[PDB]
Each structure stands twice: as structure tokens, then as C-alpha cells.
Design a protein around this ligand. Structure first.
Ligand SMILES: Nc1ncnc2c1ncn2[C@@H]1O[C@H](COP(=O)(O)OP(=O)(O)OP(=O)(O)O)[C@@H](O)[C@H]1O
Ligand SMILES: Nc1ncnc2c1ncn2[C@@H]1O[C@H](COP(=O)(O)OP(=O)(O)OP(=O)(O)O)[C@@H](O)[C@H]1O
Ligand SMILES: Nc1ncnc2c1ncn2[C@@H]1O[C@H](COP(=O)(O)OP(=O)(O)OP(=O)(O)O)[C@@H](O)[C@H]1O
Ligand SMILES: [Mg+2]
Ligand SMILES: [Mg+2]
Ligand SMILES: [Mg+2]
Lengths: 523, 523, 523
């Protein structure tokens, strides 16, 4: 309907207020100092989680303007959250500080554009500093510590992550499942994971994550694309006798012919999934073969002249479960044959050696690696189901952060990096004063999140911040210790990527918020 | 729609108030001192039951926040209630005490996390103490006493439970049915019970319990899974002539093929149930045979080459009634053949002796035991139908508690164990003061429920509690006696499991409530 | 329903107020001095763009009268915006100034008709002056500057435009696509663009622009019109096996026979597009051949006697993507054959030389040119997706302005031309005093937008305007420099066309607004 539009400060104020409200809840929560949080639901019994984001997610502002402003922060934060895996709160915190200052500057009447530019400039500088500052991720002990941070003093999670990580290998993917029982179980599962997307979000399964899990999926592998129903049909007929959920692997499915018939014609009542076959060219075929062996199913190719129609259910392999995400599709455990799987690996392994070329070797080695590596599953036990879910969520978050952290390497946590960089940043000047102030603002913003932790401590963040700044090198405040020590030595490190990601997003949000002169809402 | 969100104390207060309201009603009811209770219904004539839970169930809070808070307690309590079979109220009572104190601490501004940790720590310690404290369940006389407790001075129920228990055997399952007449009837029913789930909750019958009872069920046993309709169909055709409700036993039914056709295609107007055949492997087959003999029906196997289609109704056995619960499925009474059943038992019995191996013996013995044991049914008479229903419900509750109690063993009732443990607990210290207070709080919480009983007595719980604490060993207050005596000697014992369960859940709830900074509701 | 009607000043005032509100937001935004702008949305997260228009678009007036008045300005402005590519704001600014003065005159009670006439007369004179004033567009360096203006100090955009422009050629069309990644990519794409409309807006694709883009379009070329389904059908059948989206090229499709069947009979679920074949006569055929070669598809003609029905999918070519706009339809990249395409070009090229006649040469040369030129695609990277979209939009706007600007040639920006012309204009007199005032008003209107920029600067526009007027030749104020210098030398030039377009439209609007005695609204 009609929209109410506000311009200038009035628009800004609404945004600011909204931002603060969201930020405030988030800020307190963030930091190990902050207590976890439970979220009430009108819908049903309250949801128990430990995420800054969740608080934000819950929080809605009645005021449209405020709400919208709040929303803006959240969306950006989530984006940072996804990439970083962590630091959702941090970005929010950073954004709020930046925005407020920026708004004040707007109040100043300085031209916000320069400020944004200055902020951006500052951010870039900070990023560079951070990168230099950052150091490679430390060993598993560090990993556990990294895990613990995501843990928020969940020792078990960190341990689990480290343990899972060790067995699987850092590179190897780790999957989390609900625990069978209170005791956690870590079982390596045989199977291969290949990075393939899900063709359509429609395929995407019930769960919020949107990764699709199939129970006892059936795997059909075809090198060939599945053009039309007719070729499909005789597969289907066997499938009808089946009815265990179907997963399909094809080089590609041409959307219209297959999908049009499938969607419109076919109810698709039986669960189906489609993924592109991994790799391309011979390698793709090889990968398919590897998959096929692991599945224990067989692959049909035109070259073979095997017909999909002809192929029965038996040809299709089965998996204990399959999980698919947009980035990647994995099979937790193909039934496979133990001998068969091993034999294939050896054969591939032999091939790897055989090939003179690195390229050939790499492909072969990659192929073997996938099968050999398998996938790792982690079960989280809990005293209660609710706890388990909560624990599981935390575990998952930790895992992603840990994985990201390791690759990125770790930087001192506590926003130490942020504060440290800022000091260097301060010297840098923007082109013009307006830019200069913005740059300063950004610096100020960085400082704030350190303070917030301190505030949670109840120690006066001013002293801490001042002290932190004074210390050269990696100097920081450990909340738990409440003692000054090297962050690295302490072993509490925040991932570089996460820190970087959050800062950039927050800056972006802040800049956007500052710029946005006007807001419009519905009446 | 839009949600109203509250944070901090404000959120807490709403929860607290809600908790109190629910708790208060429950607390008074709990304890033999408390009077039973009737629940009004707008729907229709009031419902008469004797459960603390029911009061809670009825109670809804108009305030969303309060209501939600209330809900949280209830849900946890119910969970405890299910496992313990009893102590629903106790958990609620415990939770309330813990929550209030925890909230106060929150008011204190101590970091609730430590408190929760302390509480958890305290709980763990208490649990250990309780376990040591607990003693094995006493004999039937004790059992009756246990029954009486569930009875809340329902002598008959305890007697019935004991009587039923004796005949059936404690291990043997006892089932309760509405009494034919005022006089209770205890009839042992021939039949076997095997622990199998119901495939789908959809199958789950009308009654609230969700156990499904079939009247004159027909039993089809197939070793083989029922893949598809077609094989099924000729069974069905016979069934059409039939129309007595069908129960199906199959090793498994593959969901999609059978279910998809069945659900979509088949109205399923005739009652149908499916259960997995008990056991696996040969034993499963053997079990099926045992079942088949008991049913008097025949089993069809691929190995036999008998066809389901071929099999007629006659092949299917009939049961007088079948009850299915998720944990287990039982047949109250297969028509069976008296001779046939006996013969099979003997044959199995011979087999048991025959097998050298323990394993073989165990399976065989288990098989015979099921048939031999049969199931026991208890009828509850009542002056009026309404009374009977009420009585029946009480009886059922008592039975579960008794069964749980016996296995667990009995500990002094009256919350004596709780108070006793607490004293020991007090010495234990948490890591930090905040934890310490939480630990103390938990201890305090334990004490409270003893007081509540005393309050019902009208005696000043302080003195009683003090006295109780002072006494070493099992020292407690018997409400009925209003005299001090050994709980064990008194023979009023609360099950260890129930006590433990309630405490843990309550603690969990309390901890959660404390933690939950914020609540959100719809507007 | 019933309408509320206002006449005379009352109607005018509502319009005026509405105009001002819209204008005010726009005016501030306009000019590099003005900050960009973000637009709030009730619908979802706010939209980030940099357009004066967008602000106007957002702005709606609650008052019907005001809103309607506001709408009038916007619609005209947009029209100017489309043609000019730029100067949307300028027109709005101009209109507002004119309207207010005109209204005042209406208040004066002078007969507005004369005023309108005077305004029109003034406009015409101004236009002539502008045209003389205008100079040809300068070289790429200028182009970049032109780009930067559209950029609003987006250096990259200007660079991209210049870079894209250089490679493609100014004449050559440049297309913008979202960047694959943060880094922009400029790839020339092989393909030909021919100016053909889309038969129906229905065809028009999802995007707001209404240009239709097909992914991997299939191209069917027929010289012949597609009369009816039947001939079509065998094409369709092949297509059914297909299902990649179809694009159709035909000399014409007779609407009723094809469309009636197609629309009604055919769901048209598969994407389809139709375009008229470029050119007419032999040239058209030749063009088709060129297209066909580029596509790699084949064309079917009656003369050939090839049947559409007979023709398979293979005959149809494929394009990586096709974009269609009403003015023109382009194929970004036909798969084509590299050799084939080249060969055809050579063949055509030979033909061009071969033909004695200029006419023949021109057609041939044009034909070759299209293939040879190909299309250029620009990718815009962004830190974030949102940014990219915003950047992309800006880029697109810049491109259109640049293209227009170059052809038109550049005139001094800053409204320098407008002010300059006005002085000359002032001498000119209208037929009658009422006309005279209107003429003056128009002159005044022209001056205003210069002032607005100055106002953004915060410099007093009076002095600047006076100074600007005083300077002969191209004299203007550079906001960025805040120094006086030649506009041309500065290199900040606004396109003649855009300036002219905006002025004319604004004048038209203003005249209309003045004339409109009465407004009617719904109640
Ligand atoms: N003992 C500690 N001393 C100093 N800072 C710590 C300590 N443990 C963790 N932190 C810091 O607390 C922050 C991590 O907490 P949290 O994960 O809540 O923040 P976040 O990642 O921004 O929020 P969210 O995880 O909800 O997105 C990091 O800056 C981390 O270094
Ligand atoms: N004569 C008695 N003296 C002392 N305490 C008693 C006596 N009889 C029963 N109790 C105690 O009263 C409590 C049992 O009552 P009740 O079953 O109402 O509590 P509850 O199990 O927590 O509530 P609900 O059964 O509604 O879940 C136990 O702690 C039990 O030991
Ligand atoms: N440094 C400068 N000095 C003087 N005027 C400038 C300078 N850079 C740009 N301008 C002027 O600002 C105006 C262009 O800004 P803008 O594109 O916002 O106006 P617009 O085209 O009317 O609005 P829109 O683009 O929203 O339709 C032109 O008159 C242009 O010459
Ligand atoms: Mg985090
Ligand atoms: Mg009880
Ligand atoms: Mg413009």
C-alpha cells in the first residue's frame, strides 16, 4: 500500500535505534563472558541454542523503520557469519559502533560519502595489517582451543572437533549427526564426498540447513545426461518396485526435458535427488567409476551401450545415507564392497604411480583420496534430546569455525588484532578531513568489541583497551584469565578470516547505513 | 506475526511468575497429604483424575511469557514423568525452587552460567549419593507399599499391582483394562509379548496413550518384507471377505513401495497395523514360529515358497485383542490352540536343553518364556464408570512406578533421600563462588519438596527438615504417621530412578530457565 | 468511486506541494556533491542504488492530489531519463522551478497560456543555443570523464566503460552482466546483434528491464513466417526432446494463426521467444544466413523447400545466451563454428568488394560488421553481491549516458550550458508580457539547477551563478574543484542530448502543470 517515507536524520535515527537494540542483545551475548541464551517461542516450547545470531534472528523490531534497519545489519552479519563461520556477533558489534559514529558525523553534516570512503580505506588498511598479523593455524592442541572458542568453553566440543579432525584429517570433511546416546560416538564412515551442487533448491530437503539427507538412498550413476522420461522410465519401473528414496547422479540433466516431465508429470512423491557427476571428461568417468564401486552400484554409459531403461535397481547402488549441500554432495556410507572398494583404491593407486604426468597422478590421487578418506561422522550425546540438539548446533558451528580457522591460520583473539591494527591505522590519513574522521571512526569501531568483552568482564574496558593498545606485538586481554598474556601463548585465537570477514561486512553495512539518506516503509 | 521480545530480568520475571503458578497447584497436590484433584472442562463434564501432572496440564497461563515459562517446566516434567513413571510433581517442585533461587542470583547479577554449572555439579554429586543410598526393591509386601504410594493411599491399587505382579511375575508385563464390573478381575491371558515398535504413529490408534488396540485382530506373519501391493493383494482379497481388523507382522515393510500404495491407493478403512517381526536371523524366524503357533495362524516364507497371495485368511491367525506401543507390541490373547501352544513350548523347551551353547539356550529359553509367561490383564471395577476410568488411570500409573521402582530398588521416600544427599552435597564446593551459590541453591531446592509435604501436613517444615537432616542414615518424616521412623522400616520408599530422573530434569529446566536471558512471544 | 475535485489555486497548490517534496529529495541527491542514496523497503532488506530517479520512484505522496502531481513529474522525468539516459534529476529540478514560478504567475492571475507559450518559446530558443554550444564528444579520455559523471565519481565504472567502449568500439554495443567475481571481467563475445523488436511484451522476460535473456537459447531461423502449428509441430516434437529454451527467428509470425494456437493451445511452459528476421528482401535472407552461420544452426526456406517440420533440433542453432530488447535483439554468443564464422565473414567481405554498387557494398559491409563486431560483455565485480548489483546498475546507466553523450557530443556540465543559454534567452521577448514573464521564468528555471549543485557545495549559488553568467564562452563551476575553470578543459561535460531532453520534458511538465486548472482524485 502507501508507504511512509522518511529522509535525512529522521530516517537515520530510526535505523540507529533499531540497530542498537539488535546490537545490544548481541553484544552482551558475544564473548565467553556473556551467558548463553535461550529464545522464547510463541510457537511452542522455547528454543535453546548459544548463538549471538540467534538472538538477532529472534529480535524483530515493531517499528518498521527500526526493524528494517535492524534487518539490514542482520542480513549482512549472517553473510559474514556464513563465510567466517564465526564472528557474526563481531560484525554486528562493529557495525553498530561504526554506524552510530557515522550517524553522528551525519549529524555533523560532514559529507558521509567521504566518511564511507575513509572507512573503506581504513578497513582495507586494517585487513592488510591483519593478514600480516595473522599466523598459521597451530596444531591440534590449538585446534581444540579454537574449538573451545567456538565451544564457548565447551571443552567436549573442542575435544570432539579435534578428535574428529585428527582421525578424518583436517582436510577430510567431518559430518555431525545427532548422538545415538548420551555418549558421543565418533565413527569413520566409508564413502566418498565429491563437491557437487544440488540441481535445484526444490530438491533441498526439509531441514533448515537445506542440505538434503536421504535415508538409504539409491544411487543411479549415469555418465549420460538424462534427456527424457522414456529412457528414464524403465529405471523408474524398477524403482516403483523400489520406493527407497532415489538419488541420481548424472553428468547433467537437461532441465527442460527431464524436469518438465518430472515435475509436472511426476509427483516425485518418492524422494529423489540429482547431482552432477563429479569431474569432467575421462576423469569424470573415472570418478563415476570410483563412486560406482564405492556405492557398489554400476554405472551405465552410452559407450557401454548399457541402457538406463535396461538397468535395474540392482545396478543402482545404495547408500546408508546421503547428505547433499549446494557446495558439495556426499555419501556418508555406500554399502559398497569392502574388497571391491579396497581393490579399486589399489587399482587407482597403481594408476597414480603408473602415470608419468603429475596431472594424471593428481587426478588419480585425488580419486583414491576421496574413497580412502571416507567421511567422518560425529555423534553428539546429550542428557536430553533438547540438549543434544543444542549441543549439536554448537558443535557444527565450532567445526566450520575450526576448519576455517586452521586454513586461515589464527590471529590473537579478543579483538586484539582489531585493536592492534587500529593503532597502525590511525596514522594513516584519509584524503580529506571527512574521510579522516571516517577512518578514525572505523578505528574506533574496531576498539569497541574488545571493550564489550571487557564490559562483560566488568573490568573497565578503557583501561584494558589502553593497556592492550600499549602492548606491542600480540598483546591482549584474556577474559578467562583476566590476566595479561600473549594471545598466542594463551592460545585463544580468533580466525583471521572470520575477523576479516566480519569487519568488512560490518564496515559495508555501516557505510550503507550511513549513506542511506532515506528509508521507506509501508504505512 | 510480530513478536514481543523481552530481555533480562523482565523476561525472567514472566517465566518465574508462570512457573510459580503452575508449581503452586502442583506442589499442593503432590504428596499423599495433598488432596486429589478434579479438573473442570469447558468442553464437557469435568474430568476426574489424581495426578499432579494433570493439574499442570490443565493450567495454562494467559500471559504468553508466563505461559511459555510454565510450558517449559511442564514439558520437562512430563519427560521425567514418562521415564520415572512418577515424580512428575517432584521435578516441578524442584525446578521451581531452583529457578526462583537462580533468578534471584540473576538478580544478584552473578553470572548464571557458573550457577548452572554448580547446579549441574551438585546434581551429579547428588545423583551419585542417591545411587549409593538406594537399595534394592523389597518384596511384594514392599511392592504393595510402592503401589500404595502411587496409589496415594489407594490400598486396592497396590494390592492389585502386587497381586497382578505376583502372578505374572515382576518381569512379566501386566496390562490394565477397564473392569468388566465393579469387582476387579485379574485374568492371566495366554499370548506372547515381543518388543516391537509400530511402524508409524499414523498406525497409532485413537486412544491418547497412542498404544493401538485392535479388537479381534487378524495376524498375518510373513518372514518376508511386503514389498508391493501385488503380492499383498490376494491376501487382501481374502481380507475383503474378512474385515475384521488386520494386524501385520513382517520382518520389515519397505516403506515406499508398500506404504505409498497402501496409504495413497488404499483407504485403509479397515484397521491395519504393522509390526516388525521380533528378533532377527533364525531366531527371528523361530520367534515368528512361536508367534504363529500362539496365534494359531501360519507363517509364510519365501523359503517355504508359500505365497502371501496364496495364503488365505485362515493362514492368518486371530487375536482376541492386540495392543501395540512404540516400545513393544503385544498380543493379549491369540486364540491359538491350547495343545498347540503347549506343544510348541515343550518343543522349544526341549531345544533349549538340547542346545549346548548358552546362546542357543538363551534364545530358546527366551522364546519359550514369552509364550509361557503370557500376558496378564487387570480389570478395574468402579462404582461408576467415571470412577473406574479414574481408578484405572491411577492403577496404570502405579504399575509403571512399581515396575520401575522394583528394578531400580527403593530409596527412602518423602524426599528423605534428597535432603540426605544435600547435606553431603553442601560440603562439596563449586569451582567459583558463583558456582558455589548455584550448588547451594540446588541443595536448597532438594530440601524444599520435603517441606512441601510437611506444609501439607501443616507441620512446620523447618523443624521437620532440620530434624530430618540431623538424623543420619535413612531418616525421614512419614506424613501419615506424623512420627519419625526409618523410611525403610516404614516401607514408604520412592523409587531411586524416579527421584533421580525428576531431579535431573528439574535441574536441567532450572538451569535452562536461568540461562534464558530473553523470551519472545507473539504480540 | 466518487471523486473529489479541486479547481483553481487549490488544485495547483496540492500539485505544487507534491512536486516540491519529490523534487527536494531529488535535487539534493543530484550532483556529485550530493550523497548517494539507499532506499528502505517494507518488502524486505533495503535496496541500494545511486539514482535521483529511484528516490523519486520511492517517494509516494499520501495525498492523492500531491501524489498525483508528484507522479506527473516523475513520469515525464522518466521519459526524459530514458531518452537522455541521464538528467532525470535535472528535468525534475527544472520542472519544479518552472512550476513554482508558473504557479506564482497563476497566483498573479496572468493568463498561464501565454506563460506556457513563453516558456515553450524560451525552451526552443534555449535548445538552439545549446545545440550551437554543444561540441562533439571528445576522445576516450573524455569518454572516461563522461563515464565518471554517470559514475558520480565512480572511477572504475568510467574506466570500464571506456575500456569496454574502446575494445568494442563506440558504435559497437556493450552489454553488462553481473561479475563472476569481485574482479571485473571484460570479455568480447562472438555473436551478432540485429535490431529487432520482441513481438510481444508477453514474451518479455522476468527482469524489470524487460529485455529477455535466454539461457542457452535455441535458435530457429526461418525465412518464412510461421503460419500455423502444424508446420511448427514437427519442429516442436524435436523440441520436446529438447526443452532448452527456444528462440525463434522468423520473417514474421502472423499473429492470429500461430499465436492463437500457441498461446491458447500451448502452455509455452518452455521458454520461447520470437523475433522478426533482420532486414528485408535478399538482404534479409543474407542476414539470416549470416545469423545462421554464427548460430551454427541452419535456416529453412520455402525456396529451399526445407520443411520446418522436417528440420530437427540440430538445424536449430544454440546461443550461449540471448538478450532481447524491444529496440533490438542480440545474441551474446552463438556457439557457431570459429572457422565457419570466419569463413562467412570473408565470403561476405569478398562480396562487399565484389559489389560495384555502394548499396550492395553497404549491405554486405553491414552484414560482415555485425558478425565481426560481435558483442562485448562487461562483468562487474563487487565486494558483496548487493554492491555488485548496485554497481552494475550504475554501470549500465553510465554506459547508456556515455553512448548518448558521445554521439551527441558534450556540452559543459554543471548546468553551465543552461545558465549560459538563459542569458542569451533573456534578451528574447515573448509576444506579450504574460509570455514574457513565462520566458523569464523558464530562464530562471534553467539557472536553478546550477544553484542546487552549488548549494550542495554549500557555496552560495548566487555568487557562483552570477560569476558563471558573467563568464563568456564556456564558463562554469566545477563542484569538485570548487575552482573556476573551463568546463571543457575540466572535462566535465554533460551530454547535449541529455540536457536538451531534460529541459524540454521539464518545460512540458511545467507547462502542463501550470495549465491544469483542476485536479480530480478519488475520495
Ligand atoms: N578467554 C578469552 N579471552 C578473550 N577473548 C575471548 C576468550 N574466549 C573467547 N574470546 C573472544 O570472544 C569472541 C568469540 O565469541 P563469539 O563467538 O560469541 O563472538 P562471535 O563469533 O562474534 O558471536 P557469534 O559466535 O554469535 O557469531 C572472540 O573475539 C574471541 O576471541
Ligand atoms: N506417608 C508418607 N510419608 C512421607 N512421604 C510420603 C508418604 N507417602 C508418600 N509420600 C511421598 O509423596 C511423594 C509422592 O506423591 P506424588 O506421587 O504426588 O508426588 P509426585 O510423584 O511427584 O507427583 P505425581 O505423582 O503427580 O508426578 C513422594 O516423595 C512420596 O515418598
Ligand atoms: N565536478 C563537477 N562539477 C560540476 N558539475 C558536475 C560535476 N560532476 C558532475 N556534475 C554535474 O552534476 C549533474 C549530474 O548528476 P546527476 O547524474 O545526479 O544529475 P542527473 O543526471 O540529473 O540525476 P540522475 O542521474 O539521477 O538522473 C550534471 O549537471 C553534471 O554536469
Ligand atoms: Mg562466534
Ligand atoms: Mg507420583
Ligand atoms: Mg545523471
Amino acid at each position: 500500500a502507501a508507504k511512509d517515507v522518511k529522509f535525512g536524520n529522521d530516517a537515520r535515527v530510526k535505523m540507529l535505534r533499531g540497530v542498537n537494540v539488535l546490537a545490544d542483545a548481541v553484544k552482551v551475548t558475544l564473548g565467553p563472558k556473556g551467558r548463553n541464551v535461550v529464545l522464547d517461542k510463541s510457537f511452542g516450547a522455547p528454543t535453546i541454542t548459544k548463538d549471538g545470531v540467534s538472538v538477532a534472528r529472534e529480535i524483530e523490531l515493531e517499528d518498521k523503520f527500526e526493524n528494517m534497519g535492524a534487518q539490514m545489519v542482520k542480513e549482512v552479519a549472517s553473510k559474514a557469519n556464513d563465510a567466517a563461520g564465526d564472528g557474526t556477533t563481531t560484525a554486528t558489534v562493529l557495525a553498530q559502533a561504526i554506524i552510530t559514529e557515522g550517524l553522528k558525523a551525519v549529524a555533523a553534516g560532514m559529507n558521509p560519502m567521504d566518511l564511507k570512503r575513509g572507512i573503506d580505506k581504513a578497513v582495507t588498511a586494517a585487513v592488510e595489517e591483519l593478514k600480516a598479523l595473522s599466523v598459521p593455524c597451530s596444531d591440534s592442541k590449538a585446534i581444540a582451543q579454537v574449538g573451545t572458542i567456538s565451544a564457548n568453553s565447551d571443552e567436549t566440543v573442542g575435544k570432539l572437533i579435534a578428535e574428529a579432525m585428527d582421525k578424518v584429517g583436517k582436510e577430510g570433511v567431518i559430518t555431525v549427526e545427532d548422538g545415538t546416546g548420551l555418549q558421543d560416538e565418533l565413527d569413520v564412515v566409508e564413502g566418498m564426498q565429491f563437491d557437487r551442487g544440488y540441481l535445484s533448491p526444490y530438491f533441498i530437503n526439509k531441514p533448515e540447513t537445506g542440505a538434503v539427507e536421504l535415508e538409504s538412498p539409491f544411487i543411479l550413476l549415469a555418465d549420460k545426461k538424462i534427456s527424457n522420461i522414456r529412457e528414464m522410465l524403465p529405471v523408474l519401473e524398477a524403482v516403483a518396485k523400489a520406493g527407497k528414496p532415489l538419488l541420481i547422479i548424472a553428468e547433467d540433466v537437461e532441465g527442460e526435458a527431464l524436469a518438465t516431465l518430472v515435475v509436472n508429470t511426476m509427483r516425485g512423491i518418492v524422494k529423489v535427488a540429482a547431482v552432477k557427476a563429479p569431474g569432467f571428461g575421462d576423469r569424470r568417468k573415472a570418478m563415476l567409476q570410483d563412486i560406482a564401486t564405492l556405492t557398489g552400484g554400476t554405472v551405465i554409459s552410452e559407450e557401454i551401450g548399457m541402457e538406463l531403461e535396461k538397468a535395474t535397481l540392482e545396478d543402482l547402488g545404495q547408500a546408508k545415507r546421503v547428505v547433499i549441500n549446494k557446495d558439495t554432495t556426499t555419501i556418508i556410507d555406500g554399502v559398497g564392497e569392502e574388497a571391491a572398494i579396497q581393490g579399486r583404491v589399489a587399482q587407482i593407486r597403481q594408476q597414480i604411480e603408473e602415470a608419468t604426468s603429475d596431472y594424471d597422478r593428481e587426478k588419480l590421487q585425488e580419486r583414491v583420496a576421496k574413497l580412502a578418506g571416507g567421511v567422518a561422522v560425529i555423534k553428539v550425546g546429550a542428557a536430553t534430546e533438547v540438549e543434544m540438539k543444542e549441543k549439536k548446533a554448537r558443535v557444527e558451528a565450532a567445526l566450520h569455525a575450526t576448519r576455517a580457522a586452521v586454513e586461515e591460520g589464527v590471529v590473537a583473539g579478543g579483538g586484539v588484532a582489531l585493536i592492534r591494527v587500529a593503532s597502525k591505522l590511525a596514522d594513516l590519513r584519509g584524503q580529506n578531513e571527512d574521510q579522516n574522521v571516517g577512518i578514525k571512526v572505523a578505528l574506533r569501531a574496531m576498539e569497541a568489541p574488545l571493550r564489550q568483552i571487557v564490559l562483560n568482564c566488568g573490568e573497565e574496558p578503557s583501561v584494558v583497551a589502553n593497556t592492550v593498545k600499549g602492548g606491542d606485538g600480540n598483546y591482549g586481554y584474556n577474559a578467562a584469565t583476566e590476566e595479561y598474556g600473549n594471545m598466542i601463548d594463551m592460545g585463544i585465537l580468533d580466525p583471521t578470516k572470520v575477523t576479516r570477514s566480519a569487519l568488512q561486512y560490518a564496515a559495508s553495512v555501516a557505510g550503507l547505513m550511513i549513506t542511506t539518506e532515506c528509508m521507506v516503509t509501508d504505512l
